[PDB]
Write a protein that binds this ligand. Sequence first.
Ligand SMILES: Cc1cn([C@H]2C[C@H](O)[C@@H](COP(=O)(O)OP(=O)(O)O)O2)c(=O)[nH]c1=O
Length: 383
Amino acid sequence: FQHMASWDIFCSVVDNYGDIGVTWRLARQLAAEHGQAVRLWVDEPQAFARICPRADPVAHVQCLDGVEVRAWGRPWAPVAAADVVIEAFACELPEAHRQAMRERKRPSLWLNLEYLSAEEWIGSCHALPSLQACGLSKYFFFPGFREPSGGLLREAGLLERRRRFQASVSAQDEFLASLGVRRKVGERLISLFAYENPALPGWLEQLRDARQPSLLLVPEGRVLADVADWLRVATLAVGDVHVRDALRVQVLPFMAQDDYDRLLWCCDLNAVRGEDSFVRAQWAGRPLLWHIYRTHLAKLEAFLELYCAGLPADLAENLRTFWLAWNAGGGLAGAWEGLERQLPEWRREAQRWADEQGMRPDLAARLVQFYADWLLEHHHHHH
Ligand SMILES: Cc1cn([C@H]2C[C@H](O)[C@@H](COP(=O)(O)OP(=O)(O)O)O2)c(=O)[nH]c1=O
């Protein structure tokens, strides 16, 4: 015997990949690490196929890594509701599903999974119940970088695996070779995952004109047209390499989520965006550059306050200036010169940040614990 609860996770893909990226990561961890029964409902199967190449985008139901991945139909096909229903990022549940949740002898626990924020105020709202009209309550679940919050997604054993990988030159060289990448001695490795960014050509010129060489690895995506314009090339295809003095640019394929982790683990600096890659870059224990797509400023400044609190003043000031300019479309010159000379110290601090965050109970564990305490309380039992 083993305790098993069922989970419905609802995901509406509006733009980009992090909403399915985060809910898929969570779904897989609930199934694989906690032995839960998980249904992940996705309204756009093509997005899911991008982050999970094993998936069949035309199938209405399929089982991947123990998760039952199901197409969110229009119109909605009525099904029974799980023990827990997660409404990710306020995507709005099907009406018939709310009826099914309330008809159960034990009504479904209804959670709203929120976007991640370092803003202090989310602590006052984490786990807040909200009575709905139908008589069910939902609970807001706010991931966060400090307590109280719902924590951060982090797989069992992740940092131990990351440390072993980064300690093995051969493991890194083998992984990079599988992408067609061969680092040169003394060449700094930078990954670029961003939105369209008018600050990019100014940074590329600084990488081109530097004393030390850089290899810029660009998974296919938005920013590639911007890079192609800066390179003055009409086409940029997977596998293409272009050299501009101290800067080498190489186009990567858009790879599976786990392979993208390994890329982040190889690089000396990871430019990332959104929500999931933002956190994966932190688990990589390496310098990072975060692109939020434009009321984004509150989240950016709040994270900088927390992330910079442990850095030396000069590193903190250059990091903040660069990140703000990176998200404001220009003004990177003085920031990058000063920031580049501090990358070794920043790397040591990034490792410490990852280790400290790694001591906090991870988000999936907190979610499973939330259900356990809620269930016991629902039956007026001790804990
Ligand atoms: C660059 C890249 C990202 N990803 C994944 C990482 C993340 O889970 C997802 C991107 O989500 P995220 O980082 O939150 O940003 P956005 O919402 O703007 O897309 O895409 C891959 O699976 N392969 C890749 O090659």
